[PDB]
């Protein structure tokens, strides 16, 4: 699907943990991990809405007490086609 789930954390360890809680929780594909600057890390998933929803809830509970923690846990059901170009497609 085209839903997008995103977690942003202060540090990489909460991010891996978020990515891990997210992909275990629901059928979502991790399309990316991004180093933003300043300590922010973003993990990005894609999938159907229900799945992304379940993934973002799981990832957010999981990373909250890890490291410097969680910054954001966000979902977008239907990503605009222009936004797809600023989105990672495979984690890499």
């Amino acid at each position: 699907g085209i839903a997008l789930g995103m977690i942003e954390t202060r540090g990489l360890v909460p991010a891996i943990e978020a990515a891990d809680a997210m992909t275990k929780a629901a059928e979502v594909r991790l399309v990316g991990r991004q180093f933003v600057g300043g300590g922010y890390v973003t993990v990005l998933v894609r999938g159907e809405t229900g799945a992304v929803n379940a993934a973002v809830r799981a990832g957010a509970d999981a990373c909250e007490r890890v490291g410097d923690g969680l910054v954001a846990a966000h979902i977008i059901a239907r990503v605009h086609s222009e936004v797809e170009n600023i989105l990672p497609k495979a984690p890499q």
């Binding site: 059901a77 239907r78 990503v79």
Partner: peptide, 8 residues
Amino acid sequence: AIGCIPGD
């Protein structure tokens, strides 16, 4: 109020 794209 949600964020919808054409065709939705």
